[PDB]
Amino acid sequence: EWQENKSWNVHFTEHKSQGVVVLWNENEQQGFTNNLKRANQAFLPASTLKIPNSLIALDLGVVKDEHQVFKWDGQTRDIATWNRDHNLITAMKYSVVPVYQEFARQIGEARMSKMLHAFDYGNEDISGNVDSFWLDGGIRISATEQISFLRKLYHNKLHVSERSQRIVKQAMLTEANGDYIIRAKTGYAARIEPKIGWWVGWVELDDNVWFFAMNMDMPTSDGLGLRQAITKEVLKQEKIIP
Amino acid sequence: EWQENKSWNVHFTEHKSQGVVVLWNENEQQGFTNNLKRANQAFLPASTLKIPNSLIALDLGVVKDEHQVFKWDGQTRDIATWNRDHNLITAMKYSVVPVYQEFARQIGEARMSKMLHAFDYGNEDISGNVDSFWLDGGIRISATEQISFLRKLYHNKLHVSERSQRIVKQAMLTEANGDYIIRAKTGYAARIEPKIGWWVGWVELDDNVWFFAMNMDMPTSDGLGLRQAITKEVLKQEKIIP
Ligand SMILES: [Cl-]
Ligand SMILES: [Cl-]
Ligand SMILES: [Cl-]
Ligand SMILES: [Cl-]
Ligand SMILES: [Cl-]
């Protein structure tokens, strides 16, 4: 069904980068990618896992609502945006590990793992857990599998309450203007080679939705902004955004 | 409690305009306005009434969700954006009267009026209904009363379901970036003198919310864009947005 579009590769090669973008046109039920093999290659999810972990935290009542404040413990960590109070909205915006580590302590490895499987979120890998259970959830996930999960979230079809799904979609809000809305989540799997950056989400237009999932080789946090830039170059080429 | 800030008047006079901006700092429970008398002056709500009317339509099941399509009837009306299919999101974005007129036909004048009173939305005026019941709801509302209603919506405190309130807040989304989110609704009461333009809503920041409600004299649809521009000049002066 899927269509390969190798002309998107220039957006990667212009930035001396290697990666994949996957797009799904919801109205047409049609997928597109620059590289079919890499679209199906599973990687550690890094902070893209915050989307399902937020659903779990809400649906178990670990997080009461998007307003609840998770106070800073006063310990100065390396990422300055972590050294402040957060709610679910801001914890997702700044990918605040200490906040989600606390969620995971309350959720527990057993509940987390079972609810992820109920979401059909990626698949367990031969390597098992390679860090802490909350950083990778014992799974790896491909770009096409991200799309399938996000489509379920969009349609409120995951096996958590509608409310939990609506709150997470709110927390995903990244950009909005008169032309489009982007709901998305970044990630950077930076501990184990190959180091991988992600951006996954969707673009809402007046009359359609375009799901996207991209990942790219990211040996250093220098090209982090290429995750969004390359994706947007594809979206612009396809006339999805101006 | 309220504080008057007459330095905001220049943003109106620079555009040969007269009007009011009201701001409410949620963390501090403090209100500010350029003109206390006009802040309390009631006007026809025009399309700002689409916020409560959307709540009513959802909570009665006239609108099933924000995805339901209200097809164009194929009749070419004066406003080009009306001459197409819409959902609740787009009907609010383009202030699509024919769509909301159909909602009102299904809701009914009795249910609409009673639910508006349950929201404490403005007050009935001596003039009664001055057009059709769905265009003004038999009420007039002040900028400060808009604030009070919007604060209830923000906190899910209105007497409709939480779901209905969350869907309407989604449909209010107007702009979002790394610095702020604006959820808002325009209006233009253009049939009866004095003709009035409105913009009402809030600005979400990482650590606070600022509610706003502005109206202005609008003898012609030429300065419609001043509703947002003047509001944003106030927000910038107050360092709420960059
Ligand atoms: Cl693994
Ligand atoms: Cl994002
Ligand atoms: Cl009236
Ligand atoms: Cl939203
Ligand atoms: Cl607006």
Technique used: X-ray
Q: Give the one of A170, A173, A206 whose C-beta lies nearest to B90's C-beta.
A: A206
Residue A242 lies in a domain: no
Backbone φ and ψ of B31, nearest 5°: -110, 150
- Name chain B contacts of A167, Cβ cutoff 8 Å: 166
Q: CA-to-CA distance for A219 and A10, rounded, in angstroms?
A: 20
Residue B103 lies in a domain: yes
Residue spans of alpha helices (H) in chain B: 9-13, 36-39, 50-59, 88-93, 97-107, 109-118, 133-136, 143-154, 162-171, 226-237
Q: Which residues pair with A30 in a beta bridge?
A: A25
Other CB atoms closer than 10 Å to residue A209's CB: what's the count?
A: 19
Task: List, as own/partner pairs, every contact residues A180-185 make where C-beta atoms lie below 8 angstroms and the sequence separation is at least 24, other chains included.
Answer: A180/A204, A180/A205, A180/A240, A180/A241, A181/B173, A181/B176, A184/A212, A185/A47, A185/A48, A185/A50, A185/A51, A185/A92
Count how many domains chain B has: 1
SS3 category, A190: coil
Contact call for residues B203 and B182 (beta carbons, < 8 A): yes
Contact call for residues B192 and B160 (beta carbons, < 8 A): no
Residue A231 lies in a domain: yes
**Residue B205 CA, ligand 2 centroid: distance in Å:** 16
Q: CA-to-CA distance for B180 and A183, rounded, in angstroms?
A: 15
Q: CA-to-CA distance for B103 and B88, rounded, in angstroms?
A: 11
Residue B242 lies in a domain: no
Cis check: omega of the bond before B242, within 30 degrees of 0? no
Angle at A204 between CA A175 and CA B72, to 5 degrees: 135
Q: CA-to-CA distance for B180 and B43, rounded, in angstroms?
A: 29
Residue B182 lies in a domain: yes
Q: Which ligand is nearest to the CA of A185?
A: 2
DSSP code of residue B82: G
| CA distance, residue A131 to nearest chain B CA (Å) | 30
Angle at A213 between CA A207 and CA A219, to 5 degrees: 150
Structure tokens at B28: 């501090």
Structure tokens at B85: 């299919």
DSSP code of residue B65: -
- Least Cα distance to A226 among A1, A15, A5, A13 occurs for A15
Instruction: Report chain B's terminal Cα–Cα distance, integer Å.
Output: 27
- In this complex, do A206 and B93 lie within 8 Å of one another by their Cβ atoms? yes
Contact call for residues B101 and B134 (beta carbons, < 8 A): yes
* Residue ranges making up the domain that contains B20: 3-237
Helices B109-118 and B97-107: crossing angle in degrees, nearest 10, is 100
DSSP code of residue B141: B
Interior/surface letters B115-137, b for 16+ CB within 10 angstroms, e for the rest = bbeebebbeebeeebeeebbbbb
Residue A48 lies in a domain: yes
SS3 category, B190: coil
Angle at B201 between CA B197 and CA B205, to 5 degrees: 140
Residue with tokens 């890998």: A125
B127 is annotated as contributing to ligand binding: no
Residue B78 lies in a domain: yes
| CA distance, residue B72 to nearest chain A CA (Å) | 13
Residue partners of B15: CB distance under 8 A and separation at least 6? B223, B226, B229, B230
Q: CA-to-CA distance for A24 and A208, rounded, in angstroms?
A: 11
DSSP string, B198-221: EEEEEEE-SS-EEEEEEEEE-SST
DSSP string, A2-53: -EE-GGGHHHHHTTT--EEEEEEETTTTEEEES-HHHHT--B--GGGGHHHH
Structure tokens at A195: 């180091």
CATH number at residue B156: 3.40.710.10
Tell me whether residue A113 is one of the annotated catalytic residues: no
- Name chain A contacts of B174, Cβ cutoff 8 Å: 176
A117 touches B: beta carbon within 8 Å = no
Of the CA atoms within 13 Å of residue A72, those in its CB half-sphere come to 14
Interior/surface letters A12-40, b for 16+ CB within 10 angstroms, e for the rest = beebebebbbbbbebeeeebbbbbeebbe
